[PDB]
């Protein structure tokens, strides 16, 4: 899985997400990466987000559509990503599952070119490239 | 603060260099993100995307991808085999059909009709680890 | 496509959605009916919704997850369905498309057993069955 | 106001009668909505759902379905051939696998492993109209 979202010089957003999925998955298994609203969601009036993690868990929470509606509601890309993760933690616990077994992260971008990211578990990084160059950051 | 690209994980740094070749020249974000992720699909040593991707339990490499532009146009393929670049086939679903998502055989039929070439995406390394997992 | 959502006597929600696709679709075409942000979404703390219409258009707008987040923001099931449709009308306009060529409808239910529905175009009905009886209503 | 069922279209009235047999007896909403939509999948004359559904371009009936309960458990199948009740196969994806969505051949393989029996879902009426459309 790699997800990528960008704001161009005209100020338009777009995103792409592609994967070979979970290794040794059942035949015919599909994760979050080809699902609009789960692996990727872009609204040019608000912003965009891509997800990382257990495909199943991102589908179950329609993760990336949630992050963008949270930026629509007025959250910064950072705040939207954190609040979206915090909602998913509450759901993992309501399902009596152990958070150590679930990983979901989001990176997000709005129309001003502000960005942000957050995850359930530590250890994921994302790359940011603007006019300060290309850098690896940690959510 | 534009143009700006973000992608997931460490292999995202070098995918971003590729996306930036389009963006620094005033190109479309749609073209930039397609080019960015295609780099990782192309790379056999990138084991979780495209060509080096680890297979399903029956040793079949099946890829999933989707793309979305700045005006709600969307394209998507899932559980498609033998095509190295699922993001371009998803862009073609978006641009060349009345549909938005194609899966399985039907996604490969369409890829081949659009001139995409049939390929073996299971590297020797991935067949090897798969068989090691079948033992375990 | 038939979508069905219910609140039981214990006060719990669930939903189901099933279809043969668009008649004479391309081999392998998938619509909104198997996609959890699009054809069906259920959150037991808030409510549930199922969609009707052109599969493509419900996927593009992650329709049913939008209706439920609108009830999460305090709209009645009716208001959430109408506001969700109104947002989709604005989007087909920005895509330079003719609304006469687009059909999308939602039916919704919240935790209190209130329900509602709305569509882009006339001509769709939905069936409601509670303790007062079964009935066909028009959004 | 509970229990209460809502479903889409005019045929939702008789699907609702079926769902209500579960709900009026204090049964689970999950069981009620599965039973409700299965009525329409079973009916060869309702040609937009299940058995009797109008095929794709090439004449195949491929069905899509998903189910979601009261605590974020989800199951989904898409473009599955030969199984009359995709909602029950989706319930089985939800309950019997660690996955959430299966498509194509892989969804049918799993259905058959769960004891669902392969059937011919193209009715004479649907082959007829399909061929009439191929002419047009």
Would you put residue A96 in left (φ > 0), alpha (ψ -120 to 50) or beta? Answer: left
The token pair at C42 is 């259920």
Nearest Cα to Cα of residue B20 among B32, B7, B8: B32
Question: Is there a cis peptide before residue B3, judged by omega within 30 degrees of 0?
Answer: yes
Option in D6, D19, D60 nearest C126 (CB): D6
Tokens representing residue D24 in the block: 């009026």
Interface contact A134-B20, CB threshold 8 A: yes
Q: What is the CATH number of domain C1-139?
A: 3.60.20.30
Residues of D whose CB is below 8 A from B103? 78-79, 103-104
Indicate the residue of C10, C39, C113 with minimum beta-carbon distance to D66.
C39
Backbone breaks in chain B after residues (C–N over 2.5 Å): none
Contact predicate C14/D16, CB 8 Å: no
Q: Which two tokens stand for residue D119?
A: 């059937």
Nearest CA in chain C to D69: C14
This structure's resolution (Å) is 2.1
| Method in brief | X-ray
Task: Give the annotated binding-site residues of A.
Answer: 29-32, 52-55
First to last CA, chain A: 18
Separation of CA C83 from chain center: 12
C-beta of residue C106 within 8 angstroms of C-beta of residue C6:
no
Cβ atoms within 10 Å of D124's Cβ, excluding its own: 8
d(CA C87, CA B118): 41
Which residue does chain C place closest to A63, by CA atoms? Answer: C37
Structure tokens at D100: 């959430």
Please state the separation of Cα A133 from the chain's center in Å: 22
CA distances from A7 to A43, B81, C68, D60 (A): 11, 31, 29, 41
Is D86 within 8 Å of chain C by CB?
yes
Distance CA(A32)–CA(B73), nearest Å, equals: 18
CA–CA min distance D6, chain C (Å):
5
CA distance B93 to chain C (A): 10
A84's enclosing H/E stretch is: helix A77-94
Give the up-direction half-sphere exposure of residue A95: CA atoms within 13 A in the CB hemisphere: 20
Cβ–Cβ < 8 Å for C135, C127:
yes
Q: Domain map of chain C by residue range? A: 1-139
Is-cis flag, bond preceding D3, omega within 30?
yes
- Which residues of chain C does D30 touch, with a Cβ-Cβ cutoff of 8 Å? 14
Distance in angstroms (rounded) separating the CA atoms of residues B101 and C128? 32
Question: 3-class SS at A96?
Answer: coil
The DSSP bridge partners found for residue B102 are B77, C29
Chain A: residue nearest B44 by CA?
A20
Do the Cβ atoms of A60 and A89 come closer than 8 Å? no
Longest dimension (CA), chain B: 52
CA atoms within 13 A on the CB side of D105: 10
Distance of alpha carbon B76 from alpha carbon C29, whole angstroms: 10
Q: What is the CA radius of gyration of chain A?
A: 14
Q: What is the 3-state secondary structure (H, E, C) of D2-27?
A: CCEEEEECCCHHHHHHHHHHHHCCCC
CA–CA separation, B96 vs B79, rounded Å? 20
Residue C98, exposed/middle/buried by CB under 10 A (0-12, 13-18, 19+)? exposed
Sign of dihedral through CA atoms B38, B131, B108, D84? negative
| Residue of B11, D63, D30, D45 whose CA lies nearest to C16 | D30
For every residue of D73-116, DSSP letters joined together read -EEEEEEEES-S-HHHHHHHHHHHSS-S-EEHHHHHHHHHHTT-
Residue C7 burial class via C-beta count within 10 angstroms: exposed 0-12, middle 13-18, buried 19 and up: buried
- With an 8 Å Cβ cutoff, are A29 and D101 in contact? yes
Instruction: Give chain D positions within 8 Å (CB) of B66.
Output: none
Contact of B66 with chain D, judged by CB distance below 8 Å, is answered with no
C-alpha distance from A27 to closest chain D C-alpha (Å): 5
């Amino acid at each position: 899985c790699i997800g990528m979202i960008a704001l161009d010089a005209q100020g338009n957003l777009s995103g792409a997400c592609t994967t070979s999925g979970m290794a040794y998955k059942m035949h015919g298994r599909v994760g979050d990466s080809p699902i609009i609203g789960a692996g990727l969601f872009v609204d040019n009036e608000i912003g965009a987000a891509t997800a990382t993690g257990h495909g199943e868990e991102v589908i179950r929470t329609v993760g990336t559509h949630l992050v963008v509606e949270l930026m629509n509601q007025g959250r910064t890309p950072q705040q939207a990503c954190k609040e979206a993760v915090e909602r998913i933690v509450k759901i993992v616990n309501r399902r009596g599952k152990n958070l150590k077994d679930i990983q979901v992260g989001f990176i997000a971008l709005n129309k001003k070119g502000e960005y942000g990211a957050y995850c359930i578990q530590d250890g994921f990084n994302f790359a940011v490239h603007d006019q300060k160059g290309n850098r690896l950051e940690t959510p | 603060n534009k143009p700006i690209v973000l992608s997931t994980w460490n292999f995202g740094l070098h995918a971003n260099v590729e996306a930036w070749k389009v963006l620094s020249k005033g190109g479309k974000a749609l073209d930039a993100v397609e080019k960015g992720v295609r780099l990782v699909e192309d790379d056999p040593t990138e084991r979780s995307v495209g060509y080096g991707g680890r297979p399903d339990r029956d040793g079949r490499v099946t890829l999933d991808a989707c793309i979305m532009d700045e005006n709600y146009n969307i394209g998507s393929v899932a559980c498609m085999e033998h095509i190295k670049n699922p993001i371009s086939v998803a862009r073609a679903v978006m641009e060349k059909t009345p549909h938005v998502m194609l899966v399985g055989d039907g996604a490969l039929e369409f890829a081949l009709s659009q001139g995409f070439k049939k390929e073996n995406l299971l590297t020797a390394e991935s067949e090897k680890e798969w068989k090691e997992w079948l033992k375990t």
